[PDB]
UniProtKB/Swiss-Prot annotation:
Ca(2+) 1 binds at residues 24, 26, 28, 30, 35. Residues 2-7 are annotated as: Interaction with RANBP9. This is Calbindin. Ca(2+) 3 binds at residues 155, 157, 159, 161, 166. Residues 11-46, 53-88, 98-133, 142-177, 186-221 form the EF-hand domain. SUPFAM superfamilies: EF-hand. Interacts with RANBP9. This protein has four functional calcium-binding sites; potential sites II and VI have lost affinity for calcium. Keywords: Acetylation, Calcium, Metal-binding, Repeat, Vitamin D. PANTHER family: CALBINDIN. Transmembrane segments: none annotated. GO terms for molecular function: calcium ion binding; calcium ion binding involved in regulation of postsynaptic cytosolic calcium ion concentration; calcium ion binding involved in regulation of presynaptic cytosolic calcium ion concentration; vitamin D binding; zinc ion binding. The modification N-acetylalanine is found at residue 2.
Length: 261
């Protein structure tokens, strides 16, 4: 299949997601390291076989990732490795364009007062906002393939909505608190209760401070994913989805919800 779509056309997100899924054996929602040496090995092949020289990015993705055995890649890394959508990717990397933790700040803006996951009509609208960011307005071919990959590659329960791990899979794992935040999954139930704990005034609202008060649990819970150094930062990022410096938990829960859906 790769061999066909890899160097076939500018393939959409589910396709490139499939081609990459081909080697994405551990289905960890990310290409592995060896799988990368195994995938990237198929890339240079898709080129040699499909009669296309390997693009500096594929040949380099291979030169770069051909040794990322102790490394992993998200949807965005592979999204643009293959010529799936040089245009749709503009929003694809919109997560990594300036910041992994910052873009997410914008992800919740349209999320209807930030429900914790975008909607079908909202996310479908969200991609548009991506268009607003790319300053190009990625055509239907760019944003649709995207709109769908958002709710599909992350389909919590298949409602049509969007959670973070999709945006987190297409976002920059490099500094994203999410890739660690997923494993950081306390539990939507502990989220609700801890949050309530952070809700010291009993007002139903958590501010960017409680956020670090949230992380304090987290770092002590997993210094492997939550460092008390970046914890204040982990409080900062969830904050990115909060409301006017005061967070409505519907924004944080998504950061570390086990996947309550």
């Amino acid at each position: 299949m790769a061999e066909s779509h890899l160097q076939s056309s500018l393939i959409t997100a589910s396709q490139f997601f499939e081609i990459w899924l081909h080697f994405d054996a551990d289905g960890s929602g990310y290409l592995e390291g060896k799988e990368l040496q195994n995938l990237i090995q198929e890339l240079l092949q898709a080129r040699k076989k499909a009669g296309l020289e390997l693009s500096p990015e594929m040949k380099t993705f291979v030169d770069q990732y051909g040794q990322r055995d102790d490394g992993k890649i998200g949807i965005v890394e592979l999204a643009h490795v293959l010529p799936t959508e040089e245009n749709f990717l503009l929003l694809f990397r919109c997560q990594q364009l300036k910041s992994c933790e910052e873009f997410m700040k914008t992800w919740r803006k349209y999320d209807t007062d930030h429900s914790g996951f975008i909607e079908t009509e909202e996310l479908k609208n969200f991609l548009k906002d991506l268009l607003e960011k790319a300053n190009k307005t990625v055509d239907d071919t760019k944003l649709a393939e995207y709109t769908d990959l958002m709710l599909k590659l992350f389909d919590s329960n298949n409602d049509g909505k969007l959670e973070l791990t999709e945006m987190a899979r297409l976002l920059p794992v490099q500094e994203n608190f999410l890739l660690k935040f997923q494993g950081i999954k306390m539990c939507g139930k502990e989220f609700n209760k801890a949050f309530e704990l952070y809700d010291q005034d009993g007002n139903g609202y958590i501010d960017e401070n409680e956020l670090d008060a949230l992380l304090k649990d987290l770092c002590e819970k997993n210094k492997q994913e939550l460092d008390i150094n970046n914890i204040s930062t982990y409080k900062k990022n969830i904050m990115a989805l909060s409301d006017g410096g005061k967070l409505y938990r519907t924004d944080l829960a998504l950061i570390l919800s086990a996947g309550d859906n």
